[PDB]
């Protein structure tokens, strides 16, 4: 028509008729995730071993170097680099990039930029369909959690080596070293997040049971119960008064939601608020505000010290403090 080249282009990005919606976050999400995906696969398979700690003992992380799926990892950037922006072109040779912890910092910068914008297009499509916009808020609870383990925690420590590796056994070392230095289990933000998922799983097992247990009889018994629902129907597929009536007898009548719109808000609000504190937990633990510490706290008269369980957890932490980075510490404090 009389439309420009640009208007032809903007009526394609914001077109909802596409199989996967792009939108304007997706024009910079899609080339960042396909960057970060395609480099994650290669370094998980063919990365040469990385000096993680700067002491020139390279750690293996590739499947081609005698690892399996569980011990495979993408090894973090070396301790000598620290927080210096280390792209591919600052290295002289390409193998100097790989040995120093190259593809960790390439992935994380494209990953975190990708998931900030995957949250963006969850808003953007919801504006293109007339939906209410707050699904993008609920995706910020993992985005707050993933920003902390990759970016907010290496800032407070000063190096990308202390961030979390991209591996299954790589994660498990990061959980151990963290609690040895910061005692995460004795921090009320990790206590909220633990209740965020034990409550979150309970509120899914309980809600999903009662909707299944109040289904209306529409099929036979040889046919599955999922055939009673036909897609896009108007009438309700389960009795709601019967499930409040059941759950009202179960504990007491005031302990239930009869308003199903107030119910589904509670299912959204409980884990999302819970993950927000355990995302802010290690965000504050990144700036060295560890947790509780009740060592040598219960004492009697005559100046003696009684053990508690907190002194037992001390012995676990003290056994891991003196073992992580085994050839690094030249000095009797772990300030770094």
């Amino acid at each position: 028509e009389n439309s420009s080249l640009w208007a032809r282009f903007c009526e394609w990005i914001t077109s909802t008729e596409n199989r996967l919606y792009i939108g304007w976050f997706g024009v910079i999400m899609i080339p960042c995730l396909l960057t970060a995906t395609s480099v994650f696969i290669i370094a998980f398979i063919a990365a040469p071993p990385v000096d993680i700690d700067g002491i020139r003992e390279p750690v293996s992380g590739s499947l081609l170097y005698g690892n399996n799926i569980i011990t495979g990892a993408v090894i973090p950037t070396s301790n000598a680099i620290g927080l210096h922006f280390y792209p591919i072109w600052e290295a002289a040779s390409l193998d100097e990039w790989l040995y120093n912890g190259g593809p960790y910092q390439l992935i994380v910068c494209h990953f975190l930029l990708g998931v900030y914008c995957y949250m963006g297009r969850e808003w953007e499509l919801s504006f293109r369909l007339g939906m209410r916009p707050w699904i993008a808020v609920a995706y910020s609870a993992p985005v707050a959690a993933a920003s902390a383990v990759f970016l907010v925690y290496p800032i407070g420590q000063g190096s990308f080596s202390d961030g979390m590796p991209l591996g299954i056994s790589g994660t498990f070392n990061f959980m151990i070293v963290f609690q040895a230095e910061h005692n995460i289990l004795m921090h009320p933000f990790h206590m909220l997040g633990v209740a965020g998922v034990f409550g979150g799983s309970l509120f899914s097992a309980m809600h999903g049971s009662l909707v299944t247990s109040s289904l209306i009889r529409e099929t036979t018994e040889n046919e599955s119960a999922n055939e009673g629902y036909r897609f896009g129907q108007e009438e309700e597929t389960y009795n709601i008064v019967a499930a409040h009536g059941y759950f009202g007898r179960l504990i007491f009548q005031y302990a239930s939601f009869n308003n199903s719109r107030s119910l589904h808000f509670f299912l959204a609000a409980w884990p999302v608020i819970g993950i927000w504190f355990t995302a802010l937990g290690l965000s504050t633990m990144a700036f060295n505000l560890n947790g509780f510490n009740f060592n040598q706290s219960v004492v009697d008269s005559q100046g003696r010290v009684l053990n508690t369980w907190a002194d037992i957890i001390n012995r676990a932490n003290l056994g891991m403090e003196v073992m992580h980075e085994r050839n690094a510490h030249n000095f009797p404090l772990d300030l770094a």
């Binding site: 439309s3 420009s4 080249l5 640009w6 210096h84 600052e90 100097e96």
Partner: protein
């Protein structure tokens, strides 16, 4: 001088540019995308008006 490299990580050069071809790359790509947007502004509505936004 075993190897030749950038030597440009701790320098604090603005926008990371050190060769002036990068400034023309930063600016010449910007002006071209602006030029296509400015031409195609004819289709995006003409809000030369007192108050014509997505108001409430």
């Amino acid at each position: 001088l075993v190897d030749e490299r950038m030597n440009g990580d701790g320098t604090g050069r603005p926008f990371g540019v050190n060769d002036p071809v990068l400034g023309w790359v930063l600016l010449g790509v910007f002006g071209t995308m602006w030029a296509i947007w400015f031409i195609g502004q004819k289709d995006l509505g003409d809000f030369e008006d007192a108050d014509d936004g997505l108001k409430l």
